[PDB]
Nucleic acid binder design. Structure first.
Ligand SMILES: Nc1nc2c(ncn2[C@@H]2O[C@H](COP(=O)(O)OP(=O)(O)OP(=O)(O)O)[C@@H](O)[C@H]2O)c(=O)[nH]1
Ligand SMILES: Nc1nc2c(ncn2[C@@H]2O[C@H](COP(=O)(O)OP(=O)(O)OP(=O)(O)O)[C@@H](O)[C@H]2O)c(=O)[nH]1
Ligand SMILES: Nc1nc2c(ncn2[C@@H]2O[C@H](COP(=O)(O)OP(=O)(O)OP(=O)(O)O)[C@@H](O)[C@H]2O)c(=O)[nH]1
Ligand SMILES: [Ca+2]
Ligand SMILES: [Ca+2]
Ligand SMILES: [Ca+2]
Ligand SMILES: [Ca+2]
Ligand SMILES: [Mg+2]
Ligand SMILES: [Mg+2]
Ligand SMILES: [Mg+2]
Lengths: 951, 906
RNA sequence: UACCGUCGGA
RNA sequence: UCCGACG
RNA sequence: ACCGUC
């Protein structure tokens, strides 16, 4: 399609000759500024390089020189820029990423570029093996609309014509020029439906993520970032996958293994070849079935596990980790029989995804994606409910048990909060336990504010309570707590994520020591697992349910027996399955294994007791509709022969053909939804259509790895021959907010949502509402003060009258930009906030109000008076305005006004020092007990309470 | 001994017991004789202060008020029948020798204020108002008066009723608390009849007959029988009452499978899972306790959950080893489970120095054991020193270290805030955190650096006095017996309720390892045993206890200083270095000490035979048992003297296993319960034992390690001397050397000057230059500050210290100031310390005296200097400073994970 | 019209 | 409801 | 004129 080809010639910004000597980081950031301010990099209207940029340490400094009338963007953080300039794009396991977003040009001119490009700011991301081996600067990733999209918003030039093949060819046929480097595509992955960037002029469109490698560049030589050697993608992938020994593999599967080189991992240690135990065979079934029982799982030495703890800074030695090691991926577990101190790791065939020689350091490096960490209570999901009911001996009882768990959870949640609201110290404790903000505080070094309040609703409640506000007395705080509760109730109504205290998601591991019989599992916790009035350190003498998400077949949930084996006691925060029996238990859980799969584990006796296991179903033959492309790399090489030249050309062919495969429309979501709609209509997940759809969805998830081909024609045919045909199925009633159904709900999800959840939530909300004014005379104290001065002074009255009028203008701006767009809400609030802060006195009175010697104007007396006056005028009319603009100063006033002589001292803490503090649970309990008698140990030579007296 | 008790006048006869008690206290404190009519208003009083006000009269005018009982205690005494939520109101007194040596009161009485105390079986059965306890100097006691004899005092205490606050009190129990605690029971009173106001007359002999059921216990030695009164006085939480059908009285203990006849479950019994659940509910615990120390009727000891129990039925069992007298378990209060304590989450114990001689004695290689303990001590001290030095480099790390170093929570909770003396928190720890929370840096502000140095210097002086060997993998754990027969001899089961943390390593249970178990103190070489930790899944529910085998010839608990399972706790260590070289020793043959230790085993029945038969003789015998047991309880305490002698003997001989060591160890085990066992042992027998069997020395010198500095000659030879003076002391001295050098080394170091703190001063100076009125206000402020600075130098720099500082502070707060005066004052603010004037006063004072009088500036205005620092360091767009209320600030604590994660970014 | 789950963030 | 990382 | 625990 030639018309598209013309539109595929000028997509990338040009690299001007005047930037040819700039570092990669400056070249990237200058290019970004010109694109943002719509200035041509080749404009001759006078551009020449500035040597100051080469030694720069802030992006703003480079941009200031540019901000010329033509110039007069989001900035990379200074730490990232310094790492890009001096740190060789790496810092403490973090890599500097070069990434861009593309969208279809809304200009339909035949000469116009098809895509518009937004280069993203330099950012840090976890490194991977390929970046560690070749350098983060040699990698570039984009999001681009999928040329196969069926969306109405696809431009006619692609939709009308050979264009999809022309777009696919543009991505992979040759090198792309950008910031002085030649980039060649090596990998692509579905990125889901993404809304186009607002700056590019709102329907979501499916996009692909494409990875490029810098094969050559101006600074490249036939290692520092500025002194790189020419290296082809074909050589890059050959280093990773050692293709000469892997030609026997289906080329689509081989291509999918590239993800192992891109996996975001923490480098722990390099092992020497003599410390690596490569096993020739997996653990096989004792029965002789041939089934593998340790798929994805191997053992590691205790010393390796200690090194992981040390490198990652863990408080404890991990029992198991999700990792990668050369060609091996999956889980590694501590060998409980290791009494030695030698570093060693073992690999199994089921872990090794290609033939690897493990020679290069980076192919002998243990990389950890995640560690098995302390567990938390989990809950149910929509997929588990129909299967639990299907396998219930008494379906009425099972439905009653799940419903009781819902009512009990809501009752406890509302009860705990209503009690905490009676005391600020107790509500602060409750709010802190409700949400986590440590990550943001650490990354920002402070509580991030939006205008005059913390960005977070929970941080706002604690910030205002810390300054003396009472959630029973101040309606604004009451409103925040109400909004937070409403959101949680809505999530329950939408997802039925019913909390089960005796439940958790745990990494699955296999028993290399043969102590577990089939149908026995071992679960030991690293610490106390709390469930209301009861606690666990292990599971024993009880039945449990295990399952994986997604669960579809009736057999995808299994009832097994928890047995604690002392031999395994050191293995904590994992669930261990038997390696005996005909079939590994993991395989029964939606085709699971031990390579990072997690199991939902439930020991709730009321949910467990009624469950009857089903046998794994005979899967229907769907080969009429599902076609498998198993062409091997060797078969692709027949087009070229043998030798280095043939291997090189074949690698680029694997990439091109895999890109074509990767870009074909995927039907996993459409088929899963059809299954939900049809199985709802039939109220069955075990009848003939349910088994067909469950078998189909299980195949569509493994599509890229298995080379499954399944297009619209095959989906139409499958529906016609085995399902309801072209008929569009309606949504289940539970997708709606109310039961519009005739009679009383009968489907378990309808019943749980409309007969149990909605009524309970309505009653608990009314009781919460039954269990406060915007007005607070303390907050009007500064206004009353100045009004008295203004009454006896004409100069003060003019200042006072100007202030009121200026506040009124900003409030109207709040109503127009926020209360009632290309600009997102935070940007719109900032715009109002900047006009608010512009309200300044612009002489002894003016000087005392301004306190100009303070760098922060928000800390002077004027800011206090401005906040008080705004409160008096708008406390009731526009509460969101007064609090969002002046909440910070309202808290200052409250803390000043509630202070009493002799009763201690309020503390003005810095933003950094405030961020590092947390509520003291022991203080809360001890203080409340004093206010309102066995000394609770967790509340009050290590020997503690052993008796009050001596008798 | 005729007029010791304050008299009760007919004018207070109708007063409620609580009113009579508190009115009597005021007269005694103010030395007014009991001018006075009962105030009817007193009957309805809900505060002692209100009763005290009516007593305006000439004799009490100006007299200092006595310590007052809290309102809740008084209201419970007036309307709550001396009981509230298991707490009992206590009538207590302290008696002292009268300084007057006149032949014409021998004791001076101080009635203590009404207070709450945990109740006991006797107070819940008869009423707290019927019990009175005193602390009286033993007549056995150079401070003793010339008049002191013992017979006269004991007869005063036990011969007859004593009159106090309208009640007749009879003594029934005594134990050593120099001072002895004596308990009295109100047998009769003015309001008593042949609720607290209307109590029936009841004799001590009847009260004791109810508790001990004397008819079925005359076979017991009366001294031992008397000791069992403690079970009735033991402070316990009542859990529940059990029906007779729910009680399983066993006739026989668990016995050795080897036919030795040894009891393997001494003191321990099983309880139903549901009984344990009730314990959790009434005590408000987070989890169901696996084990409890309690009392039930005549039974005392440990009760453990029956792991084999699947029912919801409440039941408890008792064993002969638990039951301290023949009891029928009929009365509600003899069928009530009473909890002394519960087995709760464990903490690291460390290694007590007392154990080191036995550990050295049993070491396979003594030289290696000594070097290894010294190496562990040196590494710990070096780590402590390095961590303080490193943390000082960042305020976020130092705030965390200061918080870990000291605990101010109890003070914060009782005050509802950080207590402040003048302008700064009263504590140095809270002052560093308070100032660091407003942006001050100990590396930059010398005032903080100086406090920082002074805290570490104080920590070294604490390490010098108290030597401490830290062993993370150690704990004191309640001992229990395996009722279920899964543990082999030499096998123990330990499971924890939660993660027991050692640095970098963690445990929820112990398995596949050798452990050391012992009771403190350990005397015999065999008092420490090396055994095998084996985790039995059968016992997995039993947490925060250690379970011993019930197989073998002798129970393991008995090997640990003759211990058992009645509440005894074991020191359990799983540290491989401590366990490695330890070699078990057999229990030693104990010597015959009858020539020195005399036992009185006269039974209650034999004592009654000298008075007759029938009820009248029993009553006389009960009083006779009390009198004779009083005579016994007041004899001198040789456990302390013999234990002290043993430590010195073992030290001088540097041996715990030679013949004198074993003899003394056997002797101290015998004296552990002298009153209960009826062991008579006087100074003459102690002198004979020392001369004939211990080496001849009546007096031995104190061990060198009891002194702060090395006073020995040559290199230390005793293991404890070696650790204190060859290891710890040099390492501590090196740190103090480094500290002194660092102070001397410090123009880029910490300074007193901070231009931020002069910001307000400089602001007003520019205003003052252009206005005469402002200059006059500003110059008057400067002069008044100078006046207060002078007073600080005379009063503080040089009425106690807090009162003098507070005197200067009041003058500072009196420095007080037109539109300018109004803006500075902010009079709408109730607290003037929060006004702009306080900031100016603080800033001006800092500018004038930051170099001359730094202590004055910070102690008076530190609070406002912190406000200024936090204002001045705020940057636009870099977050918002937070003004915390004093209460809300007190409830926060450093986030340990924030500190760790934030530092990692840097 | 285009899935769920785990962890982290708005 | 969006963003990142995993199955 | 003792040690330990809470
Ligand atoms: N080492 C030591 N152990 C004691 C002491 N008092 C009690 N015990 C231990 O406690 C056990 C039971 O003591 P009880 O008198 O029943 O009550 P208790 O509350 O444990 O005793 P205290 O430890 O004095 O509070 C026994 C001992 O193992 C004491 O002074 N020293
Ligand atoms: N619903 C759903 N499940 C997914 C998705 N991606 C992965 N899964 C689940 O994860 C399974 C794939 O397991 P992986 O560990 O990625 O790979 P594998 O199938 O074991 O194959 P190997 O990589 O050869 O070991 C399948 C699903 O059960 C997804 O997008 N949606
Ligand atoms: N060093 C020391 N040990 C004490 C002291 N009081 C109790 N103990 C210890 O506690 C033990 C006594 O145990 P108890 O529970 O009081 O009673 P018992 O000796 O078992 O006798 P019964 O009351 O008949 O069970 C012994 C000591 O090891 C004390 O004051 N000093
Ligand atoms: Ca898998
Ligand atoms: Ca797999
Ligand atoms: Ca005992
Ligand atoms: Ca005993
Ligand atoms: Mg699999
Ligand atoms: Mg004993
Ligand atoms: Mg005994």
């Amino acid at each position: 399609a030639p018309v598209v080809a013309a539109r595929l010639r000028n997509i990338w910004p040009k690299f001007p000759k005047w930037l040819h000597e700039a570092p990669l980081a400056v070249a990237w950031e200058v290019t970004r500024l010109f694109m943002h301010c719509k200035v041509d990099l080749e404009d001759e209207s006078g551009l020449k390089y500035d040597p100051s940029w080469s030694t720069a340490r802030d992006v703003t400094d480079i941009w200031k020189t540019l901000y010329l009338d033509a110039f007069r963007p989001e900035k990379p953080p200074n730490d990232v820029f310094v790492t890009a300039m001096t740190g060789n794009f790496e810092s403490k396991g973090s890599a500097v990423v070069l990434s861009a977003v593309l969208d279809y040009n809304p200009d339909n001119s035949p000469t116009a570029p098809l895509y518009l490009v937004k280069l993203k700011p330099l950012m840090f991301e976890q490194g991977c093996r390929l970046t560690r081996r070749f350098g983060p600067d040699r990698f570039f990733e984009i999001l681009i609309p999928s040329p196969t999209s069926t969306s109405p918003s696809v431009p006619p030039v692609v939709s009308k014509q050979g264009a999809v093949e022309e777009v696919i060819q543009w991505l992979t046929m040759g090198q792309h020029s950008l910031v002085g480097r030649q980039w060649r595509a090596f990998f692509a992955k579905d990125a889901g439906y993404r809304k186009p960037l607002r700056e590019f002029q709102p329907k979501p469109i499916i996009k692909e993520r494409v990875h490029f490698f810098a094969e050559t560049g101006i600074t490249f030589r036939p290692e520092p970032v500025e002194q790189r050697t020419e290296f082809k993608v074909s050589q890059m992938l050959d280093w990773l996958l050692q293709l000469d020994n892997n030609t026997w593999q289906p080329h689509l599967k081989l291509f999918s293994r590239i993800q192992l080189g891109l996996s975001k991992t923490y480098a722990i240690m390099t092992l020497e070849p003599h410390q690596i135990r490569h096993h020739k065979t997996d653990l096989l079934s004792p029965s002789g079935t041939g089934e593998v029982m340790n798929d994805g799982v191997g053992r590691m030495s205790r010393s390796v596990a200690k090194r992981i703890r040390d490198v990652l800074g863990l408080g404890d030695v991990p029992s198991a980790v999700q990792g990668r090691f050369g060609s091996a991926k999956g889980m590694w577990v501590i060998d409980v029989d290791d009494t030695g101190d030698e570093d060693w790791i073992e690999t199994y065939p089921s872990q090794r995804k290609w033939e690897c020689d493990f020679v290069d350091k980076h192919q002998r490096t243990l990389e950890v994606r995640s560690v098995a960490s302390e567990l938390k209570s989990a809950g149910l999901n929509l997929q588990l409910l129909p299967v639990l009911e299907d396998r219930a001996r008494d379906k009425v009882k099972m439905r009653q048990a799940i419903g009781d768990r819902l009512i009990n959870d809501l009752q406890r949640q509302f009860s705990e909060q209503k009690h905490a609201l009676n005391r600020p110290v107790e509500f602060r404790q409750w709010v802190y336990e409700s949400y986590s903000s440590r990550a943001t505080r650490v990354s920002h070094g402070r509580v991030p504010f939006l205008a005059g309040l913390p960005d977070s609703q929970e941080e706002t409640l604690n910030f205002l309570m810390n300054s003396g506000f009472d959630p029973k007395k101040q309606k604004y705080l009451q409103d925040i707590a109400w909004d937070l509760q409403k959101r949680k109730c809505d999530t329950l109504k939408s997802k039925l994520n019913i909390r089960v205290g005796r439940s958790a998601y745990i990494y699955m591991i296999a028993d290399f020591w043969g102590v577990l019989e089939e149908n026995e599992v071992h679960v030991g916790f690293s610490s106390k697992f709390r469930d209301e009035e009861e606690s666990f350190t292990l599971l024993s003498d009880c039945d449990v349910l295990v399952a994986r998400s997604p669960a579809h077949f009736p057999s995808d949930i299994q009832r097994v027996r928890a047995v604690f084996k002392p031999e395994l006691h050191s293995l904590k925060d994992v669930i261990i399955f038997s390696t005996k029996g005909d079939v590994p238990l993991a395989k029964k859980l939606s085709g699971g294994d031990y390579d990072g799969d997690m199991a939902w584990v439930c020991w709730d006796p009321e949910i467990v007791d009624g469950f009857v296991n089903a046998e794994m179903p005979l899967e229907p033959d769907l080969s009429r509709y599902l076609k498998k492309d198993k062409t091997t790399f060797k078969q692709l090489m027949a087009s070229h022969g043998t030798g280095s030249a043939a291997k090189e050309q074949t690698t680029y062919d694997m990439i091109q053909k895999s890109f074509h495969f990767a870009l074909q429309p995927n039907f996993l979501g459409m088929c899963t939804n059809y299954k939900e709609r049809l199985c709802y209509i039939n109220n069955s997940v075990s009848n003939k259509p349910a088994i067909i759809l469950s078998s189909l969805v299980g195949n569509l998830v493994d599509q890229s790895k298995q080379g499954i081909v399944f297009n619209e024609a095959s989906w139409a045919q499958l529906r016609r021959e085995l399902l309801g045909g072209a008929l569009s199925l309606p949504d289940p009633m539970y997708k709606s907010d109310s039961w519009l159904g005739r009679g009383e709900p009968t489907h378990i999800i309808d019943y749980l949502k409309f007969s149990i959840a909605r009524p309970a939530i309505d009653k608990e909300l009314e009781a919460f509402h039954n269990a406060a004014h915007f007005w607070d005379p303390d907050l009007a104290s500064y206004y009353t003060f100045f009004k008295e001065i203004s009454d006896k002074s004409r100069s003060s009255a003019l200042l006072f009258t100007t202030l009121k009028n200026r506040i009124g203008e900003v409030e109207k701006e709040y109503g127009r930009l926020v209360k009632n767009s290309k600009d997102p809400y935070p940007v719109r609030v900032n715009q109002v906030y900047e006009k608010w802060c512009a309200i300044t006195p612009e002489s002894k009175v003016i000087r005392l109000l301004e306190l100009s010697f303070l760098a922060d104007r928000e800390m002077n007396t004027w800011a206090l008076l401005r906040a008080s006056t705004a409160f008096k005028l708008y406390y009731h009319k526009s509460p969101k305005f007064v609090w969002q603009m002046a909440g910070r100063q309202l808290a200052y006033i409250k803390a000043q006004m509630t202070s009493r002589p002799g009763e201690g001292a309020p503390a003005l803490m810095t933003a950094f020092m405030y961020a590092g503090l947390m509520p003291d649970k022991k203080f809360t309990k001890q203080y409340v007990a004093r206010l309102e008698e066995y000394p609770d140990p967790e509340v009050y030579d290590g020997i503690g309470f052993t008796g009050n007296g001596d008798y």
